[PDB]
C-alpha cells in the first residue's frame, strides 16, 4: 500500500521539463534495500517491515547484528530502518530476503522524505525562532540581539514552561511532505526528487509514498 525505501542524499542539480521549464531537483541514491524482518500483529502487535541498506565489512559488523542478519538469511548492512504499514494485507507483500530497488516509484509520483536536519550548534533566539532583534542605535545598551521580557511581573511566578529560548537547534528528525519525483534513473538507482530534502550530502534518508496525495 505505502511503498518506501531507504537512500542517501547525493546532492542537488537542475533539470528541464518538456516545456523548457527549469526544475531544481535533488539526486538521491535509493540503493537496493533488503527485507530483514517483518513485524506482525500476532508476534509483536503492529504491522511493519524492517529494511536494511548500505555496505559494511563483516569484520566491522558487530556480533549481535551479525547473528541477527545470519538468522534473517541475508548479509549485514550499515543502516537498518522500519516502515510501518497499514495492515497484514499490505505486510504480506514483503518477504524476508526480498530486494527492493528504486523501480517501486514512478515519474510524477508524490513522496515524503525523512532525514536528520543539519546541525547549527548552539544558536540564539533570533536564529532559532526568528526572534525580532532590537534597535542597533538610539541608545540600545547590549540588547541588540537579546530576547527581552519573559513573562508577567509577579503573578505567574514561574516562566510558563514552553517559552521559546536559545539552545542547540537542528540535528533533529525532519520530514518533508508531497515532493514530486521528477525522474527515476533505473540503471543508476537514483531518484530526482523535486525540491530540497533535509540532511547533508551522503546522509541517510527514508523515502515513502505521500499520505495526503498518495
Amino acid at each position: 500500500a505505502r511503498k518506501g525505501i531507504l537512500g542517501t542524499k547525493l546532492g542537488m542539480t537542475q533539470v528541464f521539463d518538456e516545456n523548457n521549464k527549469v526544475v531544481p531537483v535533488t539526486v538521491v541514491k535509493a540503493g537496493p534495500n533488503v527485507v530483514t524482518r517483518i513485524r506482525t500483529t500476532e508476534r509483536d502487535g503492529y504491522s511493519a517491515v524492517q529494511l536494511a541498506y548500505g555496505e559494511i565489512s563483516p569484520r566491522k559488523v558487530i556480533k549481535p547484528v551479525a547473528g541477527q542478519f545470519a538468522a534473517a538469511g541475508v548479509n549485514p548492512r550499515r543502516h537498518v530502518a522500519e516502515l510501518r504499514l497499514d495492515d497484514e494485507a499490505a505486510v504480506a507483500e514483503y518477504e524476508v530476503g526480498q530486494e527492493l530497488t528504486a523501480e517501486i516509484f514512478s515519474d510524477g509520483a508524490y513522496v515524503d522524505v525523512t532525514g536528520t536536519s543539519k546541525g547549527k550548534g548552539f544558536a540564539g533566539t533570533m536564529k532559532r525562532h526568528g526572534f525580532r532583534g532590537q534597535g542597533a542605535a538610539h541608545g540600545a545598551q547590549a540588547v541588540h540581539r537579546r530576547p527581552g521580557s519573559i513573562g508577567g511581573c509577579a503573578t505567574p511566578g514561574r516562566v510558563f514552561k514552553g517559552t521559546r529560548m536559545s539552545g542547540r537547534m537542528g540535528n533533529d528528525r525532519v520530514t518533508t511532505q508531497n515532493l514530486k519525483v521528477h525522474k527515476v534513473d533505473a540503471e543508476n538507482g537514483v531518484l530526482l526528487i523535486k525540491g530540497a530534502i533535509p540532511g547533508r550530502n551522503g546522509g541517510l534518508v527514508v523515502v515513502r509514498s505521500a499520505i495526503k496525495r498518495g
Binding site: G11, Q14, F16, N20, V22, N188, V190, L192
Partner: protein, 113 residues
C-alpha cells in the same frame, strides 16, 4: 569529478560555441506569446559567465532606448536555439560589472584584433 556528472550529462547541451565575457553575442530565445512560439533576438555583450557545469550561466547586457537591461541565461537551457558571437572582446576582468555606469563611447568594448 562532479559526482552528479552521470546525471548532468543527460541534460548537457552540445553545439554551444565557445565565448568569453566581453564578446558581442546575439542570443535567440524561444518565447511563447499567446499560443505562438516565436524567436526573439537579444543582442548584447557578455558581461559575466558563471561556470557550474550543467548550471553554467551567462549574463548579457544591452542598451535599448537609453536604458540598460541585463539578462541571465543558462548555457544549457533548452529555451535557446542559437548563440551567435558576432565580435570578440579584449577585456581583462572575468565579470564586467563596471559597465553598469558607462554610456556610449565610455561603454564601448575593445575587439580582439
Amino acid at each position: 569529478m562532479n559526482t552528479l556528472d552521470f546525471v548532468d550529462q543527460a541534460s548537457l547541451r552540445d553545439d554551444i560555441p565557445t565565448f568569453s565575457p566581453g564578446d558581442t553575442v546575439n542570443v535567440h530565445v524561444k518565447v511563447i506569446e499567446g499560443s505562438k512560439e516565436r524567436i526573439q533576438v537579444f543582442k548584447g555583450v557578455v558581461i559575466r559567465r558563471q561556470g557550474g557545469g550543467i548550471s553554467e550561466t551567462f549574463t548579457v547586457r544591452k542598451e535599448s532606448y537609453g536604458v540598460g537591461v541585463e539578462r541571465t541565461f543558462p548555457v544549457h537551457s533548452p529555451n535557446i536555439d542559437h548563440i551567435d558571437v558576432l565580435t570578440r572582446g579584449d577585456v581583462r576582468r572575468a565579470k564586467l560589472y563596471y559597465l553598469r555606469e558607462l554610456r556610449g563611447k565610455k561603454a564601448k568594448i575593445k575587439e580582439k584584433r
